[PDB]
């Protein structure tokens, strides 16, 4: 009576500590390469921002009118999205973006700012709604008539909640000094923003820029996180985009950048710009910048794990 083991005609070559290419019976894959070209969002509150930019959800351009108080477990940014209608730029862009990606949505509430002796409805052609409008969450503060002066005003807001608030204001940089005097008046303008953790120091800078949307002026948006019961204060004498409502984070969420479609038929926790990685394998070779609960990215295309005995054929 003889003893022996099983074998196969065509084995699977694996790598060990001693050799490279040892042919065994059976071997499985440990590095994932199959990618689903969709955003698997089954069972998740999903908000596809589309043409609306993430930061815009705080200022409220027209394309973000339906995202002013969104709520989601997964947030998707699109490359066609835009944060602004009037040409401008946020200060600390990616910081606020990373804050809003894991916020679980936003919750606005009117800050209660009343004005006396100042025109409050400034609009522009590029912020189109029914006619010429502006940011739905902001107030373009201008002078009463086509000229006169801008009174040095001061307004404060106390965070009357239990969670920090997102405060966003604007600094308008006109196309020329004559237009800054036309909108607010001559003289040096200053905008002071103060709290317990914030203490900053704005001043407009008129000048000519490239015609984006056929316009040369700019608007610089700034923000701060206000702790509970702490008060934020503003001392401004012109060139001011005031906040109407404050934002409050709802909870937790996920923020991704993608260009593929949303599919509620599959579920996945690992996302990248090209789709979703649904795999149990410990490693993946699709995208190094994959986010969520992903297998750890490696450079190797494949790493075969031996699941059987060494194959020794006759």
């Amino acid at each position: 009576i003889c003893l022996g083991h099983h074998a196969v005609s065509n084995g699977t070559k694996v790598n060990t500590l001693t050799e490279r290419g040892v042919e065994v019976v059976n071997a499985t894959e440990t590095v994932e390469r199959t990618n689903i070209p969709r955003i698997c969002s089954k069972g998740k509150r999903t908000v596809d921002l589309g043409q609306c930019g993430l930061l815009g959800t705080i200022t409220g351009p027209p394309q973000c009118d339906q995202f002013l108080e969104f709520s989601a477990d997964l947030i998707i940014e699109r490359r066609e999205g835009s944060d602004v209608c009037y040409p401008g730029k946020f200060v600390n862009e990616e910081a606020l973006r990373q804050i809003l990606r894991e916020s679980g949505g936003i919750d606005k509430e009117a800050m209660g700012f009343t004005y006396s002796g100042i025109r409050t409805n400034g609009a522009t052609s590029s912020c189109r709604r029914s006619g010429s409008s502006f940011y739905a969450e902001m107030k373009w503060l201008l002078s009463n008539t086509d000229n006169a002066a801008f009174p040095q005003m001061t307004k404060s807001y106390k965070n009357t909640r239990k969670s920090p608030a997102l405060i966003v204001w604007g600094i308008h940089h006109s196309g020329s000094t004559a237009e800054q005097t036309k909108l607010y008046g001559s003289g040096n303008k200053l905008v002071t923003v103060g709290s317990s953790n914030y203490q900053q120091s704005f001043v407009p800078s008129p000048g000519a820029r490239t015609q984006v949307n056929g316009l040369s002026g700019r608007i610089d948006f700034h923000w701060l996180m206000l702790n509970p019961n702490d008060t934020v204060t503003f001392s401004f004498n012109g060139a001011f985009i005031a906040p109407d409502r404050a934002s409050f984070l709802r909870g937790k969420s996920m923020g991704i950048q993608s260009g593929v479609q949303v599919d509620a038929n599959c579920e996945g926790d690992c996302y990248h710009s090209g789709g979703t990685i649904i795999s149990n394998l410990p490693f993946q070779n699709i995208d190094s910048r994959a986010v969520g609960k992903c297998p750890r990215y490696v450079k190797q295309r494949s790493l075969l794990l031996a699941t059987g005995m060494k194959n020794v054929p006759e």
């Binding site: 083991h5 005995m309 006759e314």
Partner: protein, 163 residues
């Protein structure tokens, strides 16, 4: 898989088995115990490696609006370092697990051979190529008692001893 020259392609019932040729005829059978042990250990190794990470990583870069160049180069630098770490860990992990798997199967085969030698004390000899040269006609029911681990060590002793 050492002194056994090669494996049995016809053995499709398991990983290890007995191939007996006596006076009655030929036959091949599979040993359920050693095979089930081997596939249990390898299966448990797979289940230990097929783990889902419960740690969530957020987006730190920006594909549509590139972050500042300095912090971006720091982010790419760290991410590339971690990528090297996980590539090395994956290579070494797969290599070591494959080595221990192959040596594990060889150990299972060697233990089966050793216990089959433990059953047949002086009633049979060893050839050197993984066979047990019998010196008493062993009937098919006797070899079935060998596979079932019920071979009496002494009721065939003197007969196979004087040969």
């Amino acid at each position: 898989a050492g002194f056994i020259e090669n494996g049995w392609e016809g053995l499709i019932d398991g990983w290890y088995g007995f191939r007996h040729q006596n006076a009655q005829g030929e036959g091949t059978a599979a040993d359920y115990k050693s095979t089930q042990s081997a596939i249990d250990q390898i299966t448990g190794k797979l289940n230990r490696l097929i783990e889902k990470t419960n740690q969530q990583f957020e987006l730190i870069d920006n594909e549509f609006n590139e972050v500042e160049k300095q912090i971006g180069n720091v982010i790419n630098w760290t991410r590339d370092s971690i990528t090297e770490v996980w590539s090395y860990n994956a290579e070494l992990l797969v290599a070591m697990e494959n080595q221990h798997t192959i040596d594990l199967a060889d150990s299972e085969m060697d233990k089966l051979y050793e216990r089959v030698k433990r059953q047949l004390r002086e009633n049979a000899e060893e050839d050197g190529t993984g066979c047990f040269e019998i010196f008493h006609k062993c009937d098919d029911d006797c070899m079935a008692s060998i596979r079932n681990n019920t071979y009496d060590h002494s009721k065939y002793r003197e007969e196979a001893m004087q040969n």
